[PDB]
Structure 1
Amino acid sequence: QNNNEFKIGNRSVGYNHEPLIICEIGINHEGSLKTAFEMVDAAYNAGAEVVKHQTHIVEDEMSDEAKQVIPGNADVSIYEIMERCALNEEDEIKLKEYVESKGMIFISTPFSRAAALRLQRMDIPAYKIGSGECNNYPLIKLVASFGKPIILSTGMNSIESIKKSVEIIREAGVPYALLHCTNIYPTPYEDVRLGGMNDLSEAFPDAIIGLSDHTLDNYACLGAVALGGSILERHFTDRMDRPGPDIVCSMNPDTFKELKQGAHALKLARGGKKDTIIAGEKPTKDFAFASVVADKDIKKGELLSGDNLWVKRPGNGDFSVNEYETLFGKVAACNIRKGAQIKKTDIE
């Protein structure tokens, strides 16, 4: 598809690279650093490369109006959820240290100006912008000014809307990814629209492309690798019996390992060209292709015809099935036995 690439720390990302799975722990820790550490342990032990957090500073993120609005996958106000779930600066700094102490890359999604400045103080190697802030052009400008790569979710937004965000990003001169995304928790298969990935890469030829996913399993993400996706994001939990509005669409260690294995196969299998000559197929061609044979006894001097000629495996005859019709009307130079391959010396 393309050769766009950039680095998140030491990890190269892009079409010619192994797909990257982002383990979005998000608010799954329910505000408990202990729980967050257990989930980081589970992610490390499953082989995860990247852990993503969400950086919530409720006062800079929401006006009082947020205390009256309820999200789709919850039964209380968004302000209550974020107040209950948010880690303070001290705890989030400990979370970054812990993730990196396990050899993994820590990134996070800022939901406010204050969160973005905190992540800059911590010097994270790349920024995620959630689909809710895809059209928050003031916030994107700030984050782009940090000089780090940006991974931008694009749910709830048109290509025309996304263009303004990409413009801001290009102007700051940082590389970026676009994650196709549908922000319904959970997302029904029929609303995934994997074709949206092609729409994004077609509109934005310099973007790394991936999928942020909220379905109940790995199928959408595996199809996105098949379509050329380079970054896959699903929520992550150490076990499925945890409480939380995002747990149910999360992967756990087992299903993370499956996605990793599926994505590696699909990275290998994807792309390429129909007409590529595959050396491993040569033995098969040699026995499976047909050659021209006599369909009857043909006397010396008789004319070769569609009536005394046919074609049979294997493919080592002097004349291939491709040349069948070119023998019509040639003259038998010898007697020719029924069933014999037609030889170059069988015709004048």
Structure 2
Amino acid sequence: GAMQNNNEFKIGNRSVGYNHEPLIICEIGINHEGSLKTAFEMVDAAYNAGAEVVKHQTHIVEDEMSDEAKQVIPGNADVSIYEIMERCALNEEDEIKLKEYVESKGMIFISTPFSRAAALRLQRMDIPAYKIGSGECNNYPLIKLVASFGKPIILSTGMNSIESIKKSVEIIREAGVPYALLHCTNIYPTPYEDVRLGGMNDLSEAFPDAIIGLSDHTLDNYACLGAVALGGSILERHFTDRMDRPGPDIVCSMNPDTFKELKQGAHALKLARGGKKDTIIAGEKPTKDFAFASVVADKDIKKGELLSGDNLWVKKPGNGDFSVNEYETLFGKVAACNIRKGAQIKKTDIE
């Protein structure tokens, strides 16, 4: 019920929401492994596959983490999160050229700031919307900062309860910018059984002004396609130009072929989803005309004999004077003439 709404906002010229074509965000993320060259190759692959939006991650490691980060290992790598972010991070000059390049290909560039300095770098660049990752969903100070920039926010909600998300959404509303909530599970990769697509409806019922989507880290497109069937408006998967690239997120990334598959499925499900059972489909009319049943004589019935459940039955097609709906209303009427076995009962056959 709640995901079928008219909520919408714009990311540059692209309208997003239930009544619009679903938007697939290609998250290049840290997939370029810190090489501007590789990022360009991945942008090209995304452009050529028909992508509309390319999303980056903005890492300024010194403002993003304290020295404790050098001693903690993520679940999908074997060195510290600090080492990974330091190796992968693009400096400001390079991130500016990356945005310029994505925009040169007619695509929208957005990014996820992981820190205050990251957020301020992106505001200087003037990006059209901000993604907040699940890690920062409960980082209320960072959300305050980002919301003050006056751009729409796409908030990922993994690792956070409805009540925790509420505090983030209050800050966003107070700032007066529109937002989307992406349901998300941050296990790299995500087992099918942990996706819980019903979480999207949980989010929509709690936050009726939110545009709703899915960010996904499973091995394929099924989860995202399911999210589109349920009403999702934004789909996010990591993206790579090819699956033999190194990096911790490559495994759950889409490539050009699987992007195109998702785009086509998303289009199909956008059209198929929603609507109402009772809507009359013009195209069904011919089928109804032959497939519905009319009342027929099940026996020779003499003039003056009573019609009954023993001498009446129903058969296709639907053009007889009495529809199967009216079968029992004929019980006890009297034959106005001889009625031939197998003939449709006519209005002139009854007194």
1:289-328 correspondence runs (5 A): 289-328=292-331
Q: Displacement of 1:221 after TM fit? A: 0.0
1:131 Cα deviation (Å)?
0.0
Map 1:1-348 onto structure 2 (within 5 A): 1-348=4-351
How far apart, in 2, do the equivalents of 1:62 and 1:212 lie? 24
- Deviation of 1:293 after TM superposition, in Å, equals 0.1
Hey, what's the Cα distance between the residues in 1 that align with 2:251 and 2:157? Answer: 22
How far did 1:326 drift? 0.2
State how far apart, in whole Å, the 1-side matches of 2:91 and 2:310 are: 88
TM-score of the aligned structures, taking structure 2 as reference length = 0.99
**Take 1:258 and 1:68, find their aligned partners in 2: how far apart are those partners?**
40
Q: 1:294 deviation in Å?
A: 0.1
Corresponding residue SS for 2:54: strand
CA drift at 1:80: 0.1
CA deviation after TM superposition for structure 1 residue 283, in Å: 0.1
Deviation (angstroms), 1:268: 0.1
What's the secondary structure of 1:292's corresponding residue?
Answer: strand
Deviation of 1:300 (Å):
0.0
Residue 227 of structure 1: CA displacement? 0.3
Name the CA distance, whole Å, in 1 between partners of 2:346 and 2:138.
73
Q: Could you tell me the TM-score, scaled by structure 1's length?
A: 1.00
Show CA shifts across 1:294-338 (max 9, x none).
000000000000000000000000000000000000000010000
Count of paired positions: 348
Counterpart Cα distance in 1 of 2:302 and 2:317 = 24
Q: CA shift at 1:144, angstroms?
A: 0.1
In structure 2, how many angstroms separate the alpha carbons of the residues matched to 1:216 and 1:108?
Answer: 23
3-state SS of the aligned residue for 2:16? strand
The runs of at least 4 consecutive aligned structure 1 residues that moved more than 6 Å come to none
Deviation for aligned residue 1:140: 0.1
Q: CA deviation at 1:31?
A: 0.1
Q: CA deviation at 1:282?
A: 0.1
Pairwise CA distance, 1:176: 0.1
TM-superposed CA distance for 1:79, in Å, is 0.1
Cα deviation for residue 216 of structure 1 reads 0.2
**Aligned-pair distance for 1:139?**
0.1
Q: CA deviation at 1:35?
A: 0.2
Per-residue CA deviation, residues 189-245 of structure 1 (Å, 9 max, x unaligned), is 000000000000000000000000000000000000000000000000000000000
- Secondary structure at 1:245's aligned position in 2? coil
Task: Give 3-state SS (helix, strand or coil) of 2:55's partner.
Answer: strand
Cα shift at 1:24: 0.1
Quote the Cα distance in structure 2 between the aligned partners of 1:103 and 1:248.
28
CA–CA distance in structure 2, aligned partners of residues 227 and 173 of structure 1: 27
Deviations 1:170-201 (A, max 9, x none): 00000000000000000000000000000000
Gaps spanning 5+ residues in structure 1: where?
A: none
Deviation at 1:112, TM superposition (A): 0.2
Look up the SS of the partner of 2:319 in the other structure: coil
Partners of 2:45 and 2:83 lie apart in 1 by: 27
